[PDB]
Structures are given as structure tokens and as C-alpha cells.
Amino acid sequence: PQAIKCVVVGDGAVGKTCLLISYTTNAFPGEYIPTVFDNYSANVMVDGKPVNLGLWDTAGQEDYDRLRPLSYPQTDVFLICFSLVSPASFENVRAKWYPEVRHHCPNTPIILVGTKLDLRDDKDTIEKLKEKKLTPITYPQGLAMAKEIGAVKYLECSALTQRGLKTVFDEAIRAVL
Amino acid sequence: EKNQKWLEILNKIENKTYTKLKNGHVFRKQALMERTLLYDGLVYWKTATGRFKDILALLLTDVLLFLQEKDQKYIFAAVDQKPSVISLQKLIAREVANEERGMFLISASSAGPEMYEIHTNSKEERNNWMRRIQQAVESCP
Ligand SMILES: Nc1nc2c(ncn2[C@@H]2O[C@H](COP(=O)(O)OP(=O)(O)OP(O)(O)=S)[C@@H](O)[C@H]2O)c(=O)[nH]1
Numbered sequence A: 001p002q003a004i005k006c007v008v009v010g011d012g013a014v015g016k017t018c019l020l021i022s023y024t025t026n027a028f029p030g031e032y033i034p035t036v037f038d039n040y041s042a043n044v045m046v047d048g049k050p051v052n053l054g055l056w057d058t059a060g061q062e063d064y065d066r067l068r069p070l071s072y073p074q075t076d077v078f079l080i081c082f083s084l085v086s087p088a089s090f091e092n093v094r095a096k097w098y099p100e101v102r103h104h105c106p107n108t109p110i111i112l113v114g115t116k117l118d119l120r121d122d123k124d125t126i127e128k129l130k131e132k133k134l135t136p137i138t139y140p141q142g143l144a145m146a147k148e149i150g151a152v153k154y155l156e157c158s159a160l161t162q163r164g165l166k167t168v169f170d171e172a173i174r175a176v177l
Numbered sequence B: 001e002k003n004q005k006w007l008e009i010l011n012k013i014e015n016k017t018y019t020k021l022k023n024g025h026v027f028r029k030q031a032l033m034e035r036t037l038l039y040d041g042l043v044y045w046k047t048a049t050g051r052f053k054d055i056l057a058l059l060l061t062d063v064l065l066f067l068q069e070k071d072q073k074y075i076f077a078a079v080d081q082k083p084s085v086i087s088l089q090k091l092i093a094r095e096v097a098n099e100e101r102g103m104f105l106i107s108a109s110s111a112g113p114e115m116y117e118i119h120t121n122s123k124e125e126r127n128n129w130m131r132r133i134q135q136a137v138e139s140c141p
């Protein structure tokens, strides 16, 4: 198989570990449990090609800014993640996460991922952002952000319902082949 | 008994050997003479270029120590310019997805973290290495 390394970054509690675990195990995790460093792997066929996909979960907290780059060497594709129901995490894509990827791994494909897709329509969650004077991220806002940071694709997915989850990772491989 | 092997090892380490910590402060053999040996095993250290260096790993309290063979004696490891003595204070361990004989070691430090990849002879050995280090860190003050 062809080894392909993918690193997932993004603000804390945007859904990275769930996104990662849900894809490889088809099981949603139990408790929250913020991550410090985790390595996963999965073998999938994309366009008839056998790929040994290496996945590197990262800590979204600032306290681990010195730690996160340790997983970056030899990365083939990056996954910058924000939450479709946390406009602050969307703003950190251009503020923190794209400049960080750019600084360490220039000329490395980036896919911007929209997480927690099922919560943008869940009314019980839409009102809770009204009180905070915030509104969910629309598709066009993300696609505009994608071409701004020069990302290959803009994809929306949900780890809980797995809608569009398999697309995020198929597209990540095609950006490498 | 384990302290017996510890002492024998210490005498096989060269006198003028040293290694540089991330904060620039230098760690020398003299500082190892006080220590209690927990575990010792032959492992391989994977370099950034994918090479494997022959290593003798010594799990102590309060640190982890990597050694190389200089003919008949031992020296501190000089691999990829990383510190060859790791403080157990905020040390964690993870398993390598690519290989079940391998483990990641990330040592948080005062000048910032640092990552190590170590391959053992079997998955049982890796597993034993992890919980042994896990328990040393737990009982390290
Ligand atoms: N509704 C919904 N909730 C999700 C989804 N993905 C993750 N979550 C929830 O969001 C919380 C954070 O997800 P998590 O995967 O832990 O983010 P993270 O990126 O790993 O956070 P960190 O480790 O960097 S701090 C969890 O409590 C989880 O249940 C999703 O797709 N839909």
C-alpha cells in the first residue's frame, strides 16, 4: 500500500478526535477527554489504490502550542477543522491554524473541514448561539475561507451521523495521489 | 540486585560523556552518582531519516536514559541531537499505529517538548515498556 500521512488540527473541542475515531472504528467515543497526542491508521481503497493512511490527532489547546508541531514532519495533507456552530473556531482558521500550517509545511495540501454538521439545523442548538449573539457558519462562508487559505477542498461532515465523513478522507487522499 | 546491575552499568559508562538538555544546560555522568534502576532493555531508536540505532534503555527514577555502545563501554545517546536523558515529570507514552512493536515518547520540558520513537522486539515488550514507564511517572515526584 501507499503510505499517506494526514494531520488534523483545529481549535479545541471542534470534534477532531470524534471525527477521527468515528471514521476508523464506526463508534462514537464515550466521554470528551481532550487529546494531547494520538496516532491512528486505516487502510482504505481510493480510486482503486490501496492506501495505508496515517492519522495524527493534535491538541487544540494553546497550552500545547509547543507540542503540536512535533507531529508535522513529513505530513502529506492537513485537515484544518472548525465547528459549524462555533464562529470563533472559524475565525481561528485564518488567525492561528492556517498561518501555523503554512509556517511549518509550505506547499502541503490543506482541506478545510466543517464539523458538527448535524447541529447547524438542530433548533435546540441554533437558539443557544442567538443568546451569545452568534449564528452558525454557512456553506458559502466556509468555501470563501477555503479559497482564501488556498485549500484544495471545502467539505462539511458530522461525526455523529457520519454524513459526509467518508468524503473528507477520500478527498484528503486524492489531494496526495 | 537490580541496584547491582545499575552499579555495573554506571562503571561501563565513559567518564567524560554528556548530553545537552533543551534548555542548554548540560547533563553529565557525574550527576548519575542517588539513582534507582527500574528496568533495562535493548531497543532500537528510529531516526528522522528512518534509520534504527541500537540503544540500551534504562528506566530509572526519576529519569529515562538512552545509551549506545562505544566498543566495550557505554555513552549517552547522540541521535538527531535530541537529549538522551528524559525527565519522567510530564512524560507520556503512546503506541505507534504503523507498528505494534513501537511506541511514541513525548517529554514535556522547560524549553518545550520533544518526541522519541522506540521499537522493541515484540508487542509484549512494547506493552511492558509503556505501563512500566507509566508507573514510574506515576510514582515520580
Ligand atoms: N453533535 C455533534 N457533536 C460532536 C460531533 N463531533 C464531536 N462532537 C462533540 O464535541 C465535543 C468535542 O469533540 P472532540 O472530538 O473531543 O474535539 P477535539 O478536537 O478532539 O478537542 P481537543 O482534544 O483538541 S481539546 C465532544 O463532547 C463531542 O461529543 C459531531 O459531529 N456532532
Ligand SMILES: [Mg+2]
Binding pocket: A016, A017, A018, A033, A034, A035, A036, A057, A058
Ligand atoms: Mg482530541
